[PDB]
C-alpha cells in the first residue's frame, strides 16, 4: 500500500475549491481518508490547517479519526504516532481530540488482539463523560 | 471472498456504513471493507522473488491511468465574420494570386504519415509484474502463469490474494524487502 | 438505535436459530426495535436464498407504516 | 455545547387542546401556556396544555397573569402530575406561522428563565381538509450573527418535515430564530379507542334501504348504459386507420371509450350484491 | 449436471412466486 501510492492530489483541490461555508468539510475529510486509506500519507494535514481549523465541535472528532483511517495496519508505528499527538497533550481542553484519539486506535488496529485492548481499558476505568467514552 | 465463503469484517464495515444517517463518523467502519486487489508471489516465509509473468487480454490494455488534470485552457478568441457578399469571388480571385507567388518561387514542404500508428498494434497483453502484484479482479481468470522464467509456480493460481512460487532448481536468488 | 444494531450483530449466520427471536421483534409495537428486527434477518441470512426470508421481509416492506 | 437536529415530543391531548381552543376564540389570537418536561439535551416533550385569559393588550409578555400561573400550579401538583413549565403558544390567524414583532419580545424573557422555551405557532382556520398547520420555532442568539446560524451536526433528519416556505422566510427566516422537527407521540390504548368509539354503527350493516327506492335507481341507470352502450357501438363500428392514436386525440369528449364505461356496471353490480345478500341473511337468521 | 439444474428450476419457481406476491399487494394497494 506504500509501494503503490498512485493518488491523485488535484481532484481533491478541484473539489475543495467549490467548498462553501457548509458542513461539507467533515464530507471532505471522510473523502480523503477514503482515498488514503491504508496509505499512511499525511499531505492535507501537513500542506493546510486554517481551513481544516475552521469547523468545530463534530469535525474535530471526524479528522483525528480520518488520521487512524489513513495509517489502517500501521501495527507498531501507529502507537508512538499518537503518543506524540496524545490524549492529553494536545490540549487538555478539548475532549473530541481524545475521543477521537481512542477511536483512531480501534481503526487502526481491528481484529488484533494485544496491548492495545488494555490500553483502552485502563483509560475507560479513568474518563470524562460524553465525548471520550464514545471513541473509546 | 476468495473461495466462496463471506468476509466477516466486509459484511459488519457495511452495514454499519450504512447507518449514516443518524451518525456521520459511522462512516469510518468502511475502510473494513477494503479488501486488497493483488496477487503475492512469496515462495519461501521471507523471500519474495522477482518474477515476471504477463496478461491474456483480448485485444487491449487497461489498467490504472487517473492522468487528466488540465484545467481546460479555453479561448473565444473570435467571432467568425459572416459577410456573404463580393467577398466571396474576391478571396477566391487572392486564391489565384498564391498560385504565382507560392508554387513559382520556393514551397518544398512535406511531412509523414502512419508513424503513429505502428507503435500502437505490436503492443502488450504481455506486462510483467513483480510480488506484490496489483490485478483487476475481472482478471483473475486471464492472467498467465510464469512459465517463460526459471521460478515457474505450484499453486493452482486462478485467484487474486496469496499463493507460493515452485522456486525452482538450484541458484535460488532475487530478495526484495523495502 | 446503538442497541438496534447491536442485537442485530450478536447473532451473524445461524441461519434457522434466529426465528424466535425475528417473531419477537417485529410483532412489538416499538418502531425502532421493528427497525432491529429487519436488521437481524439480514445478518442472520447473510447470502442464503432463503425463500421464508423473501417472504417475510417483503410482506412488512408493503404492509408497515413507520418509513424507517 | 450548541444545538443539533432536535425532536419534539406532543401529546394526543396537547394537539386536541390547540385546536379547540384555536376554534374557540377564532378571531382575536388566542393565547396559552405549554406543560412538560426536558428529558435530555435537545429532544423535549409535552403532556399538557392549559389557556390564559384573554388580555386587552394582546399575545405579549402582559397577557400572562403571575398569579393565574402560580395557583393553576398549585392544583396540578397535588393532583395530576407536578412538572415544569416548557414553553408557551398562541394562534395567529391571518397567516400560517412566523414570530411576529410583540411575538419575539416575550420570547427573550422566556429563554432568560428557561433553557431554551420552544414557541409554537397555530393557525386554527387554515388547517380544514385533515392537515394541520403547526409548527414550533426556537430563537437564536446574536453572537454568531455574521457566522452560520442553527450549528447543526451529525444527523440526516434535518431535511423533512418542512422546507423553509417562502410565506414564513420572508419574515425572520432564517437568520433569527431557526425551525424544528415534531412528530407526534402515539400511543396504543388511546388509538383504537379512538378509532372505534367515533366511527361506529352496529346494526347498519344488515338495513336494506329496501326495494321501492332500489329497483327505481336499478330502472334508472340501465337506460342512460343503453345509450352509453349505443355510443360504445358507434367507436367500435368506425375503426379508421386515420392514425387511430391521433384520432382519438382529436376526438376528446371526456366521454365513452372505456372510463364512462364499465364504472357504472361495477356500481350495478355492487348495490344488487349487497342488496341480495342482505336479502339472503335475513331470511336464513330470523326463524 | 440434472441434479444442480433440478435445483435450481426449485428455487426460480419459489423465487417467483414471492415476487408474484409482491406485485398483488400494490395493485391492490394502489386502488386504495
Ligand atoms: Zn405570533
Not at chain 1, 59 to 81: D, N, P, R, W, Y
Not at chain 2, 119 to 147: C, G, I, S
Not at chain 4, 26 to 39: A, H, I, N, Q, T
Not at chain 4, 149 to 158: A, G, I, V
Request: proline residues 4%; contains cysteine; hydrophobic residues 40%.
Amino acid at each position: 500500500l506504500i509501494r503503490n501510492n498512485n493518488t491523485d492530489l488535484m481532484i481533491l483541490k478541484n473539489t475543495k475549491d467549490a467548498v462553501r461555508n457548509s458542513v461539507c468539510h467533515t464530507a471532505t475529510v471522510i473523502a480523503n481518508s477514503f482515498m488514503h486509506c491504508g496509505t499512511t500519507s499525511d499531505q492535507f494535514l501537513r500542506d493546510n490547517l486554517e481551513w481544516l481549523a475552521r469547523a468545530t465541535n463534530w469535525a474535530k472528532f471526524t479528522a483525528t479519526a480520518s488520521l487512524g483511517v489513513i495509517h489502517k495496519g500501521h501495527e507498531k508505528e501507529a502507537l508512538q504516532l499518537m503518543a506524540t499527538y496524545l490524549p492529553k497533550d494536545t490540549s487538555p481542553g478539548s475532549a473530541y481530540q481524545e475521543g477521537g484519539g481512542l477511536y483512531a486506535l480501534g481503526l487502526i488496529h481491528a481484529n488484533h488482539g494485544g496491548d492495545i485492548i488494555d490500553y483502552l481499558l485502563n483509560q475507560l476505568k479513568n474518563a470524562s463523560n460524553d465525548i471520550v467514552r464514545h471513541g473509546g | 471472498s476468495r473461495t466462496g465463503h463471506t468476509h466477516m469484517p466486509s459484511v459488519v464495515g457495511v452495514l454499519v456504513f450504512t447507518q449514516f444517517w443518524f451518525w456521520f463518523p459511522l462512516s469510518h467502519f468502511l475502510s473494513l471493507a477494503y479488501t486488497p486487489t493483488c496477487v503475492i508471489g512469496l515462495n519461501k516465509d521471507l523471500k519474495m522473488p522477482k518474477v515476471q509473468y504477463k496478461s491474456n487480454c483480448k485485444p487491449s490494455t487497461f489498467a490504472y491511468p487517473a492522468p487528466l488534470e488540465v484545467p481546460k485552457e479555453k479561448e473565444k478568441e473570435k467571432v467568425s465574420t459572416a459577410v456573404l457578399s463580393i467577398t466571396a469571388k474576391a478571396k477566391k480571385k487572392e486564391k489565384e494570386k498564391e498560385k504565382k507567388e507560392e508554387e513559382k518561387m520556393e514551397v518544398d514542404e512535406a511531412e509523414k504519415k502512419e508513424e503513429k500508428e505502428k507503435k500502437k498494434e505490436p503492443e502488450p497483453n504481455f506486462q510483467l509484474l513483480d510480488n506484490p502484484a496489483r490485478v483487476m479482479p475481472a482478471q483473475l481468470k486471464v492472467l498467465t502463469m510464469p512459465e517463460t522464467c526459471r521460478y515457474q509456480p505450484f499453486k493452482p493460481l486462478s485467484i487474486g490474494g496469496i499463493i507460493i512460487l515452485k522456486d525452482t532448481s538450484e541458484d535460488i536468488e532475487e530478495l526484495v524487502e523495502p | 438505535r446503538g442497541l438496534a444494531v447491536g442485537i442485530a450483530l450478536v447473532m451473524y449466520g445461524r441461519m434457522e436459530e434466529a426465528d424466535a427471536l425475528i417473531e419477537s421483534l417485529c410483532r412489538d409495537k416499538d418502531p425502532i426495535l421493528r427497525r432491529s428486527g429487519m436488521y437481524t434477518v439480514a445478518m442472520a441470512y447473510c447470502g442464503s436464498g432463503n425463500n421464508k426470508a423473501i417472504r417475510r421481509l417483503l410482506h412488512v416492506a408493503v404492509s408497515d407504516v413507520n418509513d424507517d | 455545547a450548541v444545538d443539533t437536529a432536535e425532536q419534539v415530543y406532543i401529546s394526543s391531548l396537547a394537539l386536541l387542546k390547540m385546536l379547540k381552543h384555536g376554534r374557540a376564540g377564532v378571531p382575536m389570537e388566542v393565547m396559552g401556556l405549554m406543560l412538560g418536561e426536558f428529558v435530555d439535551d435537545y429532544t423535549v416533550r409535552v403532556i399538557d396544555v392549559f389557556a390564559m385569559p384573554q388580555s386587552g393588550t394582546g399575545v405579549s409578555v402582559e397577557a400572562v397573569d403571575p398569579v393565574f400561573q402560580a395557583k393553576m400550579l398549585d392544583m396540578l401538583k397535588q393532583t395530576g402530575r407536578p412538572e415544569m413549565v416548557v414553553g408557551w403558544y398562541h394562534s395567529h390567524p391571518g397567516f400560517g406561522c412566523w414570530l411576529s414583532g410583540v411575538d419575539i419580545n416575550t420570547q427573550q424573557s422566556f429563554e432568560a428563565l428557561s433553557e431554551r422555551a420552544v414557541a409554537v405557532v397555530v393557525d386554527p382556520i387554515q388547517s380544514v381538509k385533515g392537515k394541520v398547520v403547526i409548527d414550533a420555532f426556537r430563537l437564536i442568539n446574536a453572537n454568531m450573527m455574521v457566522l452560520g446560524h442553527e450549528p447543526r451536526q451529525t444527523t440526516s433528519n434535518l431535511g423533512h418535515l418542512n422546507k423553509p416556505s417562502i410565506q414564513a422566510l420572508i419574515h425572520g427566516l432564517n437568520r433569527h430564530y431557526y425551525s424544528i422537527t415534531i412528530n407526534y407521540r402515539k400511543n396504543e390504548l388511546e388509538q383504537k379507542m379512538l378509532l372505534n368509539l367515533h366511527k361506529k354503527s352496529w346494526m347498519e350493516g344488515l338495513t336494506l334501504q329496501d326495494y321501492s327506492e332500489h329497483c327505481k335507481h336499478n330502472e334508472s341507470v340501465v337506460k342512460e348504459m343503453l345509450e352509453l352502450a349505443k355510443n360504445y357501438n358507434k367507436a367500435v363500428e368506425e375503426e379508421d386507420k386515420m392514425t387511430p392514436e391521433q384520432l382519438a386525440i382529436k376526438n376528446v369528449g371526456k366521454q365513452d371509450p372505456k372510463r364512462h364505461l364499465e364504472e357504472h356496471v361495477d356500481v350495478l353490480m355492487t348495490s344488487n350484491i349487497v342488496q341480495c345478500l342482505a336479502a339472503m341473511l335475513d331470511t336464513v337468521v330470523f326463524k | 449436471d440434472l441434479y444442480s439444474r433440478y435445483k435450481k428450476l426449485q428455487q426460480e419457481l419459489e423465487f417467483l412466486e414471492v415476487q408474484e406476491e409482491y406485485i398483488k399487494d400494490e395493485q391492490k394497494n394502489l386502488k386504495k
